[PDB]
Structures are given as C-alpha cells and as structure tokens.
A paper describes a structure:
The transcriptional regulator [name] from Desulfitobacterium spp. induces expression of halorespiratory genes upon binding of o-chlorophenol ligands and is reversibly inactivated by oxygen through disulphide bond formation. The [name] associated with the o-chlorophenolacetic acid (OCPA) reductive dehalogenase (CprAB) from D. dehalogenans and the closely related [name] has been shown to bind OCPA with μM affinity leading to sequence-specific DNA-binding, and ultimately transcriptional activation of the associated cpr gene cluster. Members of this family are homodimeric and contain an N-terminal sensor domain linked via a long α-helix (involved in formation of the dimer interface) to the C-terminal helix–turn–helix (HTH) DNA-binding domain. We here present crystal structures of the oxidized ligand-free (3.2 Å) and reduced ligand-free (2.0 Å), OCPA-bound (1.8 Å) and DNA-bound (1.8 Å) [name] [name] in addition to an intermediate OCPA-bound structure obtained by soaking ligand-free crystals (2.0 Å).
Numbering used by the authors:
A (entry chain B): 19 to 141, 149 to 226
B (entry chain A): 18 to 141, 149 to 226
Write the structure that this text describes.
Amino acid sequence: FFPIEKLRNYTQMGLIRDFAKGSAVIMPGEEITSMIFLVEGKIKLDIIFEDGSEKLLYYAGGNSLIGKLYPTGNNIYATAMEPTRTCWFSEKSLRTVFRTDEDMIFEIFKNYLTKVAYYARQVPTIRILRLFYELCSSQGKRVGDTYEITMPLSQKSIGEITGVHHVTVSRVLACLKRENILDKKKNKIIVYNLGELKHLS
Amino acid sequence: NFFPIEKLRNYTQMGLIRDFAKGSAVIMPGEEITSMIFLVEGKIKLDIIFEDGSEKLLYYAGGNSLIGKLYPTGNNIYATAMEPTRTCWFSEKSLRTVFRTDEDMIFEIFKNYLTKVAYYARQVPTIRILRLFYELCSSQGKRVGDTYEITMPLSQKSIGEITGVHHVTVSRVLACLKRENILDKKKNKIIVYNLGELKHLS
C-alpha cells in the first residue's frame, strides 16, 4: 500500500467522498487531477491498455495514496473493493496543505520516491535463449553440427513461459533464426550454433 | 525516458554543483545519498546490486533528469558518469529553500516523480513457471503411471531468468507445488504428479 498516514491529520483540507462496494473510483478515463488519499477501505487499480484489455496494477489499502495531479499517459480503472472512504486532494488543496506545514512536502516525496525505488527495482531476449538452451541441453540430440529438439513450442508459449510480449518473441526468434543460431521449424527445434547460444545465454 | 524536469535548471544555485569526470562513480555502492541529484549535462548509468552482490541496470539518466533520493530506500545503487557530466545536489534543507523561493516546483517534481511510477508500474506471474513446465511436460513428459517424467537440469536461477521471476517466488513456489503435490523437481528429474491440475492453474 505504501500508506502515508501522517496525512490523516490533514483530511479536513479535503473533499471527502464515500463510495459503495463496487462503485468505480477512477473511471477508465474520467479525467483525474488530484491525490485521492484513501482513509478507510480498499481499491483495485487496473490499467486499461489501449487495445481494450484489463490487467491488474496494484491494490490500495487504507492509508495509501492513489490519484495524480495531471493527465499521465494511462487509463486507470479502479473499483472500491469494499465500502471505502477517500479524501480527494486537488493541487490547490494540496497547496493549501504544504503552506500549513512544509514537512508534508517531503512526506509525499518520500512516499513517491519509495514507490519509484520499488517498481523500478523490479524492472528479455535472454530469458528466451535461456528457455532454449535449457531445452537444447536436456532434449538436445546431435544431428551433425546442429542439435534437434522434437517438440512444438509456439510463439504464444514462449511468451507465456518467458513472460515476454509477442512483438519481441517474434523479433528475437526472427533474429535467432537470421543468425544460423536457431530454427523452431513447426514441430522440431534445430539449434545450429550451441556455443553461441550458451554464450548469448 | 530520462523524464527530464527542465524547470529545475532555474534553481541550481540553491544546490551544490558536483562535477564528475567520465568513468567516475557518481554513486558509490552502498554510499548513502541524501540529495536529489540533478543532471545538468551528461549521462549516467545507474546499476543496482541485489543483496547477493548481483548487478543489473536500473535506468539511464540524461540531460535534465532527477535521480537521487532524500532518504534511505533499501536499494543498492551504483552510478557512473558515462559521459562527463555536471550534476547539482538537492539536500532537503536546500529543496526546502527552493520550495519557499518557489512553491510551484513542489508540483513540478511531484509531477515529475509521480510519473515514473506510472511508467514503471505500467511496465510491470506464477503462471509462467507452471506454463514453463506445462509445455515442458506436454512435450517432454514421459508418463510413469500417474506421473510424467522428464530428464533435465533446472537450476532454480535459470527459472528466475527464463521467467522474469523473483528468486523468493521461484523458491517459494517450488515450495508450494512439491508440497501441494503437483510437481517435484528433485535433482536431474522432473516428476509431475498432476498434469490435469497443472493446466487448471496455468
């Protein structure tokens, strides 16, 4: 949640909006321009990617801060998971705060910073040729200077298995190919240069 | 996306200018940073270290990026100026100056910062592993009674690479199958003790 309690002393500078259990909290592109400090309760922020798709992002426990003070590249769609109470902070209430006490400036920074740390700490190609070498070096059965693996394993499945976005499972499988490194010809995997796999892996 | 915050160029005087010839550690490893660093010319690779001396690259930073931090963060940072680079350092006591001189910046950063979380979160799951085995099984599995038996190495680590998966999970996940009863990975042997429920969960 990365709660920022300190701020509950400060909600009276806010717009308190209570929401029922399911009622959409940020719309999928209702335009949102304020920090939504979440005081009792819980919220599910998913992103709607621009295809139409769905995909979780992160929950918001009590005390957490969600929202934003800007248009910020993405469509959020967040549901109240349980009858939840929230205090909205416009920039101008937000201002009003900092004037009433600096420390909170930092307070949010901290909270943001942390959040950066966090997600950025977590954050392809090799995860691929790792999967392949794995297979080649177990299932590998020599055919002259290449090695054959008698298994379908289709683009979709490398994606799934590698947690890798298709355009990449393509480009790279394309590139493994173009290199006399690897054919996944329909049924069977033919590895032309194993030393070069191991090494890129 | 060196999420530059050009506005900050206007207040470097409230800051601390620290210059950094190429190759030079802008962030030593486990040296403690309590200042926003503001990149006023140049280019840094930030790396991290996992608590297991592992290294991998955190971001770049470019003309007008803000890296650095005002607090502890339980991350292990190693920045080096690729190019010769002018920085400028924001202690709190100093940003605390800037925000009085100029209360607007408080939002120009909050934006700034608020935005990378977008970014990152947007980029950013047990699924895979199973799935990894699942294909691995359906293709290689040699059914020994109710079990399906492949002969491979699968170093806990390789899985964590293959699958963009944190070691705790890989670990805490071979934990949850070998238990559950699904899968045992015991040395040079896969031994799936339930393909049906294996694909239910995938």
